[PDB]
């Protein structure tokens, strides 16, 4: 129902091993569609989803121009942030930026995003009002002052309310057969004895898109949140995702346990049990 576009920028310094590397990736929901790598033999914006390939030469040239300029800009930024923290030229450091727009189940802008991190720590973020900043420390306050002078928040508001939404809706239409197609999980329960009087029940969900899913185990109709092992949702490699939830049960008590699956691709939420 709801959709989003996100760009993810990563710039990493590497003293003694060349200039900092700049990588940019673009996503619509859980589907990557573009990439850029400054380390590539011939750095250029490349398609990563079939539905983006139809975009003309102007699109790709403009993307590449932007990312090539960002490569240089982020190298300067890394030099600046090193200075803000009194860090030596010897250590490796990372700046990450993620930005983009959310849409509800109708089409208009729900919320805009722009967030930055330095060495994995939140550094500066655009507030939900798309007008003000939250700076993490006195270093980020310098960045804030620069960004207020350069009208950055205003540029971001214009982009997030306008071009971001416009292009997301265009991508959603062009890639509708995949992006607006929810694939339900294929689900089953496996039984693995651990001892004479305990066994693991593992509830599988496979081949689903998007990644959003709820897998829960219940005993006598009561959630077993503390006793359930839930692995991180993982990509299958074919656009789809996988997940499982496992619970250790007393032997003979298996039928007191139910797995519940909630996903967009399903006509109705599933209730599953182990079938001997």
């Amino acid at each position: 129902g709801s959709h989003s576009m996100r760009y993810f920028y990563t710039a990493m310094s590497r003293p003694g091993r060349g200039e900092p590397r700049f990588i940019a990736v673009g996503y619509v929901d859980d589907t990557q569609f573009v990439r850029f790598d400054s380390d590539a033999a011939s750095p250029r914006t490349e398609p990563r989803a079939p539905w983006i390939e139809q975009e003309g030469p102007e699109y790709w040239d403009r993307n590449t121009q932007i990312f090539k300029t960002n490569t240089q800009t982020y190298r300067e930024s890394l030099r600046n942030l090193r200075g803000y923290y009194n860090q030596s030229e010897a250590g490796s450091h990372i700046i990450q930026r993620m930005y983009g727009c959310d849409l509800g189940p109708d089409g208009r802008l729900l919320r805009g995003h722009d967030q930055s991190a330095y060495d994995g720590k939140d550094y500066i973020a655009l507030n939900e009002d798309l007008s003000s900043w939250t700076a993490a420390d006195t270093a980020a306050q310098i960045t804030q002052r620069k960004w207020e002078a350069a009208r950055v928040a205003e540029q971001l508001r214009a982009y997030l309310e306008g071009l971001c939404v416009e292009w997301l809706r265009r991508y959603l239409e062009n890639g509708k057969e995949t992006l607006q197609r929810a694939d339900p999980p294929k689900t089953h329960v496996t039984h693995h004895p651990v001892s004479d009087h305990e066994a693991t029940l593992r509830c599988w969900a496979l081949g689903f898109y998007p990644a959003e899913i709820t897998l829960t185990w219940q005993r006598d109709g009561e959630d077993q949140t503390q006793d359930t092992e839930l692995v991180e949702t993982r990509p299958a490699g074919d656009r789809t995702f996988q997940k499982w939830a496992a619970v250790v049960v007393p032997s003979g008590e298996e039928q007191r346990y139910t797995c519940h699956v909630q996903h967009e691709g399903l006509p109705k939420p599933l209730t599953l049990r182990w079938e001997p």
Binding site: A24, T69, L81, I124, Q155, L156, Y159
Partner: peptide, 9 residues
Amino acid sequence: KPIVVLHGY
């Protein structure tokens, strides 16, 4: 489509 190159940090 990405936003234009914004000011450095």
